[PDB]
């Protein structure tokens, strides 16, 4: 059970740390019980969540994931 998420997290603190200023827009797969804290961490930075999509998993199935 994996999700395909596109998201965008600006740190808002690169100007006082002088970091690499790398890209903040990604399309990644995340597993089932992991997307929970990923959701939460992306919302911690005020990040926009563009689109959540099912990669792996049939919904409504109970045994066998």
């Amino acid at each position: 059970r994996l999700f395909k998420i596109t998201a965008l997290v600006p740190s808002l603190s690169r100007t006082r740390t002088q970091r690499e200023l790398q890209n903040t827009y990604f399309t990644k797969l995340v597993p089932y019980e992991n997307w929970f804290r990923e959701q939460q961490r992306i919302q911690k930075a005020g990040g926009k969540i563009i689109k959540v999509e099912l990669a792996t998993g049939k919904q409504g199935t109970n045994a066998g994931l």
């Binding site: 109970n62 045994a63 066998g64 994931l65």
Partner: protein, 159 residues
Amino acid sequence: IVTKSIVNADAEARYLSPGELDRIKSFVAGGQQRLRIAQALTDNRERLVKQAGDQLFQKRPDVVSPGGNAYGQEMTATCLRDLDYYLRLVTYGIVAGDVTPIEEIGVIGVREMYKSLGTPIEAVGEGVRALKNAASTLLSAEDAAEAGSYFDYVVGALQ
């Protein structure tokens, strides 16, 4: 048990090692005894729920007491329905040969569910112990051992 070996060899980049193929062949051999044990627990369900409610309400009378959760006919019917659910999941685990399709439906989030329902989990563990005792009386020795296996897993899981 085939999904266990498949995801086990799937995390690695290797194939299924032939010792795992030996354990799959042995489980395939024992599947007929597994099916007979599951059918014997299947057809005699209401006896097992009756004797489990018997031994539980003899053991812990607080669910019977009005401060407890299983007070009244509706709540005691929900209680025996929970015991029916756990017997059903035990038959699933008996067929599957490994405790994954029973833990996925009955174990993995049970503590917070029973905590936010008010019921104690130790009484549920005693109920599954009573189910194990009644199925041990119902089956033969090599069948009661192999049933008390998965019943033992549920009793350890609810605690």
